Amino acid sequence: SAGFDRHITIFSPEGRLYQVEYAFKAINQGGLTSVAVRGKDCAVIVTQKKVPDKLLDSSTVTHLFKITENIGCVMTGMTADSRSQVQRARYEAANWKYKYGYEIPVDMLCKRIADISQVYTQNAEMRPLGCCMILIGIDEEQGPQVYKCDPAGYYCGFKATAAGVKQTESTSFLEKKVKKKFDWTFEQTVETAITCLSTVLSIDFKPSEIEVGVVTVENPKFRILTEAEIDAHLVALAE
Amino acid sequence: FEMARTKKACLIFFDEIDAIGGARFDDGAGGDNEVQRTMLELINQLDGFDPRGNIKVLMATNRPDTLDPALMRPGRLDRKIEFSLPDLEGRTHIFKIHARSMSVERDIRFELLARLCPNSTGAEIRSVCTEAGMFAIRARRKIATEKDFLEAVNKVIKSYAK
Amino acid sequence: YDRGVNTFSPEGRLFQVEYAIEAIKLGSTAIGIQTSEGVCLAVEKRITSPLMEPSSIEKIVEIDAHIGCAMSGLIADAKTLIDKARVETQNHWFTYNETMTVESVTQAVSNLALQFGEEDSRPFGVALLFGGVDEKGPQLFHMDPSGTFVQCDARAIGSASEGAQSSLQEVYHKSMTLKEAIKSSLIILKQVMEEKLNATNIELATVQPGQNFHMFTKEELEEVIKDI
Amino acid sequence: NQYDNDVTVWSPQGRIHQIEYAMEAVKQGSATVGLKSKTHAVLVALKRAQSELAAHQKKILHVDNHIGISIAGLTADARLLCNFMRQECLDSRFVFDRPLPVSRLVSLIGSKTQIPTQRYGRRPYGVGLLIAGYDDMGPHIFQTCPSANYFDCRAMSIGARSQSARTYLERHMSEFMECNLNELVKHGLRALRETLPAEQDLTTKNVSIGIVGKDLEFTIYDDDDVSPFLEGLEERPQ
Amino acid sequence: TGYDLSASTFSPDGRVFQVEYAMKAVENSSTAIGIRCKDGVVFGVEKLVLSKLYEEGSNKRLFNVDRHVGMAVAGLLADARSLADIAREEASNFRSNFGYNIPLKHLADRVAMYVHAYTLYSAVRPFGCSFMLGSYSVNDGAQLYMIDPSGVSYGYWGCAIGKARQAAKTEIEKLQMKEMTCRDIVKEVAKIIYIVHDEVKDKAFELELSWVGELTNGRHEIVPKDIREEAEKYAKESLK
Amino acid sequence: RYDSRTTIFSPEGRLYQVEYAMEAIGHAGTCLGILANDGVLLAAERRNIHKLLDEVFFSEKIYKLNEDMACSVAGITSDANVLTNELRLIAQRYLLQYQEPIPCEQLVTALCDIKQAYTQFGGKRPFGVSLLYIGWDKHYGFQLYQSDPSGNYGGWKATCIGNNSAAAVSMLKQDYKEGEMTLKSALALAIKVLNKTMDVSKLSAEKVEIATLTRENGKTVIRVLKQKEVEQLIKKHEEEEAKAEREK
Amino acid sequence: SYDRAITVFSPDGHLFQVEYAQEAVKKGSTAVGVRGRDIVVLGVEKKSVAKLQDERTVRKICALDDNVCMAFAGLTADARIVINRARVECQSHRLTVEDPVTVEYITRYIASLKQRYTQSNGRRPFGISALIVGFDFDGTPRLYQTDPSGTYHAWKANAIGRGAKSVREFLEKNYTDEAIETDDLTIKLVIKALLEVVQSGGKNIELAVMRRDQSLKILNPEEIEKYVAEIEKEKEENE
Amino acid sequence: GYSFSLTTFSPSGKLVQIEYALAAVAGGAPSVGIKAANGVVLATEKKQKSILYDERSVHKVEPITKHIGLVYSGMGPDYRVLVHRARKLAQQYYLVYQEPIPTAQLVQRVASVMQEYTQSGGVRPFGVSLLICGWNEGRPYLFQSDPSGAYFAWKATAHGKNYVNGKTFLEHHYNEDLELEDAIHTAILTLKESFEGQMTEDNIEVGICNEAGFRRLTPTEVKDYLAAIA
Amino acid sequence: REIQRTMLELLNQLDGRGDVKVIMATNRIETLDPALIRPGRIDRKIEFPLPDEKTKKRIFQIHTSRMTLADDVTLDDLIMAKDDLSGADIKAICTEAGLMALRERRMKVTNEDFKKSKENVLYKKQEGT
């Protein structure tokens, strides 16, 4: 068991994901939680912005990162790995518009991040960025799209997803809720995201302890909510 | 120590005190670990100039760098002494001593034999004297000679240093 | 402890340089002596088999007409440094159009030796003595494998280095004639190399300000070989 | 103990003990001193002997006509750094014809000393450097260490048997600043005399000095050049 | 422990130990605090003076080699000297490439990029130092950021790093950092540094201050409170 | 523990990693070049005979490296696949440069040089391929060669590598035909060796690969045998043993 | 330090890992070489061709140039690589450079090559010793021993391989002050030295001669019986 | 132990590290492929390991060329990276050699790309085994490529989880005279044999190389066999 | 690492002389540290060459003294050609030849038994370069 995981290049006797799951445990060491939902024409990301201390400039402590104005991102895990990978996605999108020019789908962007992570995995030089992204975007007549990528090089499109400390139980609540054909309206999407976080956070939703972002066909500009807007959308569950 | 004090005062001496007076090695994580159980019972139950009964004690080892400062400090040691390879006067005097240790043609130029030896020990001097004895034996000669001493010295000086 | 030179001892010493210091002893005895009359060098020629070419053990060598070298250690790594010392004189010829001092040859060989710890190869197991009659007069210099260098009025390297050095400290001063320095060196050499002296196990060379020529004082030095 | 390796590895305590091993490698014997005044800066390094037929080794180098240094060990990295300082001064004269000030030169040397400490494939520096200089701002004494730090000092001393010298310098820092050249070198040599072994008195054959000032380049003095500075030395009372 | 020796190896659980040892290295370092004001930032840093060999003042830890970038550091000092050059570069690089001053958030990103990247590769290790950005610009006022050698970095009203990282928080929160002028923030920072281990153990001690704001044209000056000593005497006011 | 790295002198002075590369053949597929003069052949046995193997390769142990030179391989499949095409690249380069077909011996030495180089440098692994060579050249004509992963080589009149090489060399000593090494006598030897060296009983010919080379039409030809003709050859072996039966 | 690596000294200055070259050479073939009155003569034994095997491809001696060749005791792959280096080196140097090639020059080059391959990690120094004999060095033939360590020397007569043990004494037992006269006594002393080989009868004892002016000449099987009979008769008459 | 490097031998004259990647392949999801007179079938079972997954967006059958189909067993990231590399090799070959690449040449060159990692300790192999299929000159082709850089030609094969079961099942039904729709029936049969739990056409995907090109099957077309499959 | 302390114990038992005589022996003498084989204290260094001709005759005769020889094999061909073999190899040859005669029920040992005995035995040593 031991020894066969001290370098990323080493395959286990069973060919298992030792160092990959070590990176995932490092992600869990970044003790925050995030959730994302998709809908008929809307998609929402949200992160557990548990206020670390009052001395931090709350505007800067974001884990939501607008990489391109149509592309929304929510991150979980290592802090500086988060920074590096978000910057890498920014540079990938900039290059995509530099050489091809046309829009980069969330599909293609998260796939590029994923196979770059795989390139990290294939070489002993590079430690894969111990952080997971959920990306959201708009594509042709498909409504919004939500995809997830992570240090394994995994890459999947989701109707809903989650990550972080409450990853398993948040995904369980999703699989309890999204497991039905229903009217997933924008108000319903806000309801689903806030209920997903409210079933795992156990603390009542003050306007300042989370970050909410959204991408919707009706307004393809990716958004990040402020405290007042957070409350003005939590009233959808205060009802 | 108890059986020595049952004697009418006694003198006790230890050799390779490095292997005994050497301090704790935790990072070994086991192995031939009996040292760690025994050695302090020398070092810490040992007495010095003040706490010592009617007993005289002497230590020795070829490697002092590893010894526990507890042995180095008092209550264990009252003096430390250093030696080297026998000097030219020393090497001459060793052969002077060993001229008693055999029957030889006692007209030897030990003064030159000690110089034909470069930097060398004194145990090898004893070995060389017995090696001149070997020279007599292989020749079946009833007495040793200066040529036996010369080529017995060269036995080390040439073949141990060629 | 001592896998590489990237780290020192818990005392701060490298566990490599002193290894070169005793590796000095894997070769035969060697002597260098500076006098106001010049510089002389000597090495024991003790053969493996006399039917080897007896000059092929080139442990006493000329670097140029005014400069010579002696070595202690393995001949292989010594060859590189000796070749460096020889080629720098021709580099001076082709660049400055004049001769090169033994001090700067010493400095260049020192910087070539000082490469294994600050590249970006490996330590050299040889100690070198140069004797020159250069633009600054007679000049004997010594390098250990560490890449440092020091002026020496005399010096001893190789097997039985330190005994010869200590005994020579009784019979030396800065400015005698090189001939009596040769005699005093030989009366100690006779006991340092093996037992007895001849071309199979002795070799010596010298250079003088009155002789910027023929450092290879061999087989014409025969008289002082039989003076002792 | 596993954590005694490449400067890339931190010990669990949060330290790189190999740098401390280089620092202790610096502390291995005879004394060196450095100290400056309003008018001048001075460094001294005793040339250690080897035998009665081998020469004392020089330990003082000249960098530029306003700066010089002093070196402790087998000079593996010390002399290379001295040559780099010389080339940097040459580049300063190539760009603006000026001997660049001491402190802003030593800052780059500190950065260079730090550079290996982050990466593999390069041992840490095994020498400590003393520096005496003067510039368009004033005279300065600097010193650098394997820990890549640089210090502007009124006095400094690296090696062993020098804690007495360090204490004398700590006592007469009250004087070092206002002294002239001669008084400053007298103070340094008094600190050195505080380092005398039991069986010895200071000899010309080993004492070697480097001196710089507001009206003097960095220059090196030996034997009978040191003696005009050795006069005025502390006596031997009890 | 164990899966420790390289920064490119994730621990089986938790986070990289090669970085936690740099974290613990920062713990032995001398304290440094930073507080913003209306038009700029102020820093207060404590440092030993070794012994009387020291020239009564030397090798200070504050630096100012930029138009608007103010910096404080803690941890291993030589790594901090090597690290400040990254910001010195990036500011001028952005200003020349795009024609205007870089936003401080982007600077805090692109300076800590190198620090974290030296953890990704087993050949190297991150800088063993934390740093403290504080600057002022026309379109966003005055801002202040912490960067930790692990690469953790965020904006702040005021913060403290060193051998006193936790206690000084209670001293920071009692200042109206949004309103109070840098002239008075200098004195407040001086007395706060004096309160939290002035010379309790490191008795051979010296204190240094910072003053960067638009009244200083956004530039950083090492405010000389050795003269007129009003911050010095105001700090000594708190001793009893 | 001197085998822990590729480039290590043992106190025996032996490089145990190269010796391990030698040992790797101890489980490789068998292939032989029988004693053949006026022609030359290489034959081998197949490990992968299975009900669903497609065998669209048409050759997986014998490999034709040039229009007049062929090779047979035992060892690492991937190293074999890269080395057999390195052979073709060497032939193409030599033809482009000299405008002449490469000699067999020079080709063997050149490729063994690459193998030796890979055995010499750290951070590198020897190609786990041992292999036999046949071809015609202006220097000697038909030749038979053997080469090790270490870069060692030898010229042979008959040889075999892989599993059960001891029995093959023993019967090659037994059925030796020095000088009269005509190709059809080599086929007669093959008929028995294919059933003998193979650990099988009552060998089926489809597990066997056979190829030959001869100056039949002046411009040199290389031939490969299909299932039916090898079955007829094995039938001739069967009737040889079924007439030796008269004394069994 | 220990013998686990070449590039570090033993705590007594030894280089055990390098010094293994002696038994590295010793377990190869057996060869002897001399320079006669003018003509150098070399001999090899220990072929032991296994019936279908040949010594033709074994090539213990290869002629590099019309005035230089060597003998290759040690592993055969490294011997062939040394063939391809030295032969092409001397050929190109003579064909292109203003100066000709000599056996001294090729010995220098091989010594430098082996020393340089000792000068680095991850590069195995060649495990072969060799007798390199040349016809031209200012017109005079001579002989050299070369060793994996990069050391080289000149000899009047030497032996390499498993015969390097006894012949060191054997030569000193019978080498006259007279350099072995003409080719008669030169080949006779070659046969005497090679008598330490298995049977000394010429059954697998072969030799070659280079006359200091003409290229390597082979004592081919149609004639080597004459030299074998000469050696046998000389050993029989002196009994 | 010797698996800590890929460029050193075990005493058995083996390379331990490669069979570990093969074990990872064995842990991969099942894949199966067979040939019939009309073309070649490749198929793989897909799971909504979480129902959250976008079913129709992600795929495992991938077209290298419009006459070459490819499916895999093993890990997804390495698989996708090697598929992009294989495409960037195959289309380059089509451009340079003035010919649509033969299936055997494509398999060999992808195997060489795989072999590239079988030397030096700085890189690791892909943990993926590929089933490759094609149509060339009216003739169907099927191949397997493995992490070792080795490759094989199969008339019918299956690998991944329960791979030996797939082998035995194919031996129970395969004949070289199959017609491609009954070939689809046997392919979905072995896919249903391989996986546990209820199965539908959305949890299965198939690619077909007809002599009229390669194409992936639509869930609408997969429904033609999902119902009335025994 | 007790082997070095045992080495010091060995030199102590040798010198510290008395009646007991102490033999050392091995084939791999070329590796030994001069601290162990120190000439001047270690008295004699005896050597066996490879068994010469007359030695080998005596060894083959003694090792064949028990089995029923036949005049078709005078052991000369097995004995006098070269640096053939050691005495233990001779003993092994005789034993295997006896077994060889046993399996063929030849309770009269013949030349061919010894011939294949050599043919089998001589291959049982490892290779070189």
Author numbering:
A (entry chain H): 6 to 244
B (entry chain A): 261 to 422
C (entry chain P): 8 to 127, 134 to 241
D (entry chain M): 4 to 241
E (entry chain N): 5 to 244
F (entry chain K): 4 to 251
G (entry chain L): 2 to 240
H (entry chain J): 5 to 234
Copied sentences from the primary study:
The 26S proteasome unfolds and degrades hundreds of proteins to maintain proteostasis, regulate cellular processes and generate peptides with second messenger functions. It consists of a 20S core particle (CP) capped by one or two 19S regulatory particles (RPs) that gate access to the CP proteolytic chamber. The redox-active thioredoxin (TRX)-like protein TXNL1 is expressed in many cell types and was proposed as a nearly stoichiometric component of the human 26S proteasome. It uses its C-terminal PITH (proteasome-interacting TRX) domain for binding, while potentially reducing disulfide bonds with its N-terminal TRX domain but how it binds and is regulated remained unclear.
The following PSRpt6 state also showed two ATPs and four ADPs bound to the ATPase hexamer. Furthermore, Rpn1 is highly mobile, likely because its anchoring Rpt1 and Rpt2 subunits are at the staircase seam and simultaneously disengaged from the substrate. Because of these higher flexibilities in PSRpt6 and the consequently lower overall resolution for Rpt subunits even in the locally refined map, the nucleotide densities are more ambiguous, yet our nucleotide assignments are reasonable assumptions on the basis of the observed densities. For instance, in Rpt4, there is no clear density for Mg2+, γ-phosphate or the arginine fingers of the neighboring Rpt5 subunit, suggesting that Rpt4 is ADP bound, despite the nucleotide-binding DGF motif apparently being inserted.
